[PDB]
Design a protein around this ligand. Sequence first.
Ligand SMILES: *c1oc2c3c1C(=O)O[C@H](COC)[C@]3(C)C1=C(C2=O)[C@@H]2CCC(=O)[C@@]2(C)C[C@H]1OC(C)=O
Length: 872
Amino acid sequence: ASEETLAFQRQLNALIGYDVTDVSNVHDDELEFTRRRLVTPRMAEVAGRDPKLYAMHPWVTSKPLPEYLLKKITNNCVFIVIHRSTTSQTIKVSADDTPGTILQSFFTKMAKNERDFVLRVCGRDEYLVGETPIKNFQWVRQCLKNGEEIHLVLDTPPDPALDEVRKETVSLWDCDRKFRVKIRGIDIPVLPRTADLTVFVEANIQYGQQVLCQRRTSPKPFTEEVLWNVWLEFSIKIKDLPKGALLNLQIYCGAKQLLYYVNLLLIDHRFLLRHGEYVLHMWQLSGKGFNADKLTSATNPDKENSMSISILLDNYCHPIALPKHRPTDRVRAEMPNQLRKQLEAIIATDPLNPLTAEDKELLWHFRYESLKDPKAYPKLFSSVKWGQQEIVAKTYQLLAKREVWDQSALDVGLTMQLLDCNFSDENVRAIAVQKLESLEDDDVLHYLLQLVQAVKFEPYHDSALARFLLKRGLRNKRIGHFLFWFLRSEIAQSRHYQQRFAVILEAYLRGCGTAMLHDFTQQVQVIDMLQKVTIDIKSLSAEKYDVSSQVISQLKQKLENLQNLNLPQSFRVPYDPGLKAGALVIEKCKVMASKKKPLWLEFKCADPTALSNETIGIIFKHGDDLRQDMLILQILRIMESIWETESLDLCLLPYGCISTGDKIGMIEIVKDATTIAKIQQSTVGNTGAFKDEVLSHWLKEKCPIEEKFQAAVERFVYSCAGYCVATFVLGIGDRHNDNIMISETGNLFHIDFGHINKERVPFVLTPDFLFVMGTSGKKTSLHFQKFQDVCVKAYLALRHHTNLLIILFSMMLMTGMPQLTSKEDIEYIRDALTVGKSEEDAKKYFLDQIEVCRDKGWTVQFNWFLHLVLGI
Ligand SMILES: *c1oc2c3c1C(=O)O[C@H](COC)[C@]3(C)C1=C(C2=O)[C@@H]2CCC(=O)[C@@]2(C)C[C@H]1OC(C)=O
């Protein structure tokens, strides 16, 4: 290992934010083993990607043009403005022309080596190239909807050389003996403050979040060291242990409640049975009383303060689990009319609905019949007795013939269901991933965060899903960019999965290319520098007192030093990679008058071809985990895409928001916007006597032109409806006025989500909102009626994708929540979506929620004010 190799590893660890070679918190070589195994997948993808297309990362879609965009185009034509220097001409092209047919058509119009130029969006690293109709480019579709013009510049294609990549005994199943483990003792440096506590150890053999067998030790006084030296034998036979099963060890604390836990994979990555002595440091349960963290094979790295449990496993030779080999029978394709019909009723049931013992027997007995319907796969494989060798073997025989599933249409919702906490079998999970291979880059982008979170449900570090993500990231820069940040936010805030995520990110970084490696370095530099600034200014972490003029002046000064000669002169915006930020506009920079004192920063665009002088407003938030906001915003983007397929535009505004490290992140500053509470405070003040006409007045004053005002109101009508529906389905509608913003164009949008007997409301639809829509009293109106229709429309449209939302919601709660979630928490979504109900009842249900808000008036906002502002 030369200084070079060591040096390279060093920088990668800096980009990752974790030392991927660290072995201070491992009891085996699974992680290192995974690093080695990911080497081939990475190299294979690197050598298979096109050097030019990878360099210009065209952002396209194969989806049809939405109904609301079809209107925007007159006669299959599109106008584009091409620039040179100041030199610029406007051309009219066909919506189906390829960027090549464009340039060739440009050289013929204006005329007085040759085709060595490329079309790039003005002021952005976004290229319109490749054999694709101009109308199938995301930027083109964006401009259309926004009504903005399409300005492209004629520059030289980026040399793909800049993406250069650096140089690169035997026992079988048979073991009729029952599995057993010995609990030696538990040890903890410091113990709780009640000192009359009792504790016992519970050992579970879990699979797919289900307990196959459980054993417990007797209760003993809770002291720094508690020894048992007792053997716990389980009712399951060694030969019946399925690959991916875990020995879940938990400690309960009572008086004389789960408090500590740690897991250990029974069958390792090499198909060998786990044996030997083990000293495992456990995690402490925060929820005094469930989630992805409880399934981790990772141990707590903090040895000096955590609880550890010492156990002993059977130590003989080396029993190895034999990989299945499909031989072939009873397909039994016929059943009684009633039986058949009651089988289809079980399958037709929603995800959250539990299966009874009898329900599972029918599904399993008629496996092959159930196999004919993809939507039955989750229920079917959840009816498999995974704790039985014979049954599992039969399960693989069943999956052998997957022609029906192989030909089935890609159903993202259905696929995600097989990648959650309920399935630990590699074969079942692998078939879900098989289907994901069909997703085009644009769709991978919509579900990327969710897929990354799903890696937490994988029993092993190396899996089909982890490799899938690696591959798509290496194949497309935009996906690679976001993958980088999503993995980095987990590695920095999650000790439960940081080791596994670090291995996956290192594999991506060794194949993304020199150019991207340089971009990531600059972005990370700015974030590290900005973070230290928030750490150097000690008062920034003090919520007790307000922000003085001296601290702000101190902020401007420190930003000045950095900018002199140390801070990157330009970097890509984490949440908007196509945009390059340049120098800071120290004058407009400051410390927000917020309790959390976030940095309000403004930069200039580093791209000179930018057709504007507006700054890039970025909030550098510190002291807050922004992972939940990212999840909420992404689910909102998913709702947008869902509404797009149903041909609907709810005008949501999922602004940029990305966690960039440990309790730090960057948030997009929406231009020309203010808080609803702010608008109220200007007229009234620091009191709860809210006026109903303030909002409308504010909007009109911002839109003195007839046409403009009605355009804004219509926008308000849509955006208000979109958020009411969206926030209601997610169960986060009852919010304080200061968490809702509005732009001068009338766009309403919720912000600052954070970790989210009395008066309650389903969502925010206050008198000021109803006012803008021309409704004062309890009387209807033209705009309000529209509002009601749009709400119903968007609402029903979401129900058409119930299973998708249900699974997305359950995973989000399980992976993006500190505390433990229950079935009750997940079931909320099922009720909010009126599952089982007919469209009619559903339409009325939502309309009823709209009525609750009218009767409530300002009541709820007034209580929020009394609480949040007056501490009442
Ligand atoms: C921490 O989520 C957000 C914010 C915070 C915070 O503590 O203060 C404010 C919100 O105060 C109610 C932050 C910085 C803001 C946003 C946010 O999501 C908004 C997202 C869209 C937008 O324009 C932002 C950046 C405004 C910003 O609020 C203010 C009052 O400047």
